[PDB]
Amino acid sequence: LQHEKVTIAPLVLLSALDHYERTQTKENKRCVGVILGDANSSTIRVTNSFALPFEEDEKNSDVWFLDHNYIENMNEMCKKINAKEKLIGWYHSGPKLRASDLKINELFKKYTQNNPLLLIVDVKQQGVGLPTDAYVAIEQVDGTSTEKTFLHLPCTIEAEEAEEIGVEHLLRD
Amino acid sequence: KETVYISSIALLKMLKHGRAGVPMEVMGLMLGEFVDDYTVNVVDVFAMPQSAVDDVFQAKMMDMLKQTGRDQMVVGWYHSHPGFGCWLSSVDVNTQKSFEQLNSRAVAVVVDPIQSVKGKVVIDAFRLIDHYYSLNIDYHKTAKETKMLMNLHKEQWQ
Ligand SMILES: [Zn+2]
Numbered sequence: 654l655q656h657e658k659v660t661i662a663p664l665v666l667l668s669a670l671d672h673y674e675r676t677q678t679k680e681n682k683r684c685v686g687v688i689l690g691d692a693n694s695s696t697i698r699v700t701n702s703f704a705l706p707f708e709e710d711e712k713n714s715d716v717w718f719l720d721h722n723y724i725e726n727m728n729e730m731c732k733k734i735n736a737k738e739k740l741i742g743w744y745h746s747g748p749k750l751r752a753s754d755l756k757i758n759e760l761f762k763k764y765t766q767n768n769p770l771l772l773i774v775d776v777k778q779q780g781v782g783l784p785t786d787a788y789v790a791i792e793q794v795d796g797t798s799t800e801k802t803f804l805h806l807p808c809t810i811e812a813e814e815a816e817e818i819g820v821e822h823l824l825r826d
Numbered sequence: 827k828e829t830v831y832i833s834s835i836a837l838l839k840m841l842k843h844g845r846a847g848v849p850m851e852v853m854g855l856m857l858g859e860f861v862d863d864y865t866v867n868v869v870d871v872f873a874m875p876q877s878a879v880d881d882v883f884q885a886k887m888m889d890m891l892k893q894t895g896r897d898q899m900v901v902g903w904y905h906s907h908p909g910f911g912c913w914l915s916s917v918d919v920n921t922q923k924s925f926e927q928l929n930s931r932a933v934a935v936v937v938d939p940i941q942s943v944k945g946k947v948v949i950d951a952f953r954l955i956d957h958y959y960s961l962n963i964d965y966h967k968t969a970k971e972t973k974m975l976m977n978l979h980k981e982q983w984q
């Protein structure tokens with residue numbers, strides 16, 4: 654029941670970057686989408702993704718809008734292609750956690766079989782390690798009450814065999 | 827003289843779809859632009875369900891991608907040959923004829939996801955003569971994609 658680590662396919666990171674670039678996201682703006690894969694074991698496998706329409710107010714972090722209908726309509730098309738890649742959470746371009754992220758995460762709790770994963774993908778990556786930070790929501794305990802917070806989980810990259818050759822092929826031009 | 831440029835996510839999605847569909851031939855649509863007389867730019871692809879192309883599925887996917895900043899037109903189709911190389915069968919030629927009637931520049935890409943695991947991607951791009959011929963394929967990589975992929979490879983295998 655406890656997730657302990659996350660693996661991510663290279664395609665997911667490239668898809669997040671393509672989403673960021675094709676929507677001309679700049680400045681402090683972020684793009685947001687869904688991640689797919691398998692979260693029924695202690696290692697969450699993140700193997701696909703898709704972009705969401707998403708707007709949020711520049712200053713008021715309390716004003717944001719995510720199209721429920723888009724989530725459902727697109728996930729159903731993904732189901733028709735590969736039913737094994739379940740909706741397991743969401744991603745955004747960060748580069749860091751934002752004040753609205755716990756409330757947005759509550760929206761995705763209605764779509765996931767397990768506790769949702771948030772993947773922050775730093776698409777403006779300079780050179781220091783994996784451009785990802787993975788989080789799940791937990792209750793954190795003063796020891797008189799608890800509050801919801803995010804727990805960082807370690808990530809590694811895991812590529813399917815043909816996708817790994819794809820990456821090497823791209824790198825070799 | 828003509829080149830088909832394939833984006834990073836287009837290549838990986840075609841390999842992924844083809845691998846997941848083994849032992850079946852799976853197919854999808856290629857999105858992009860006919861930028862001039864000598865260049866087809868494939869910026870993205872999407873899978874079609876196994877089945878005669880489902881026009882309702884295609885239209886819906888196109889509508890939703892436009893809503894998230896992907897408004898490129900269909901420039902052709904891809905499908906997988908799991909283990910037996912890149913070429914067009916008679917059924918493939920008929921399918922390509924349908925695409926060429928809609929746009930004379932449409933391209934048929936064939937990927938072999940099984941032979942690809944031996945170390946080099948096995949992929950080709952075809953158009954009909956009026957039986958068929960191969961188009962040169964090249965890959966488009968942005969500086970950001972190159973840096974991302976180089977860093978991921980170094981992190982994974984050091
Ligand atoms: Zn075929």
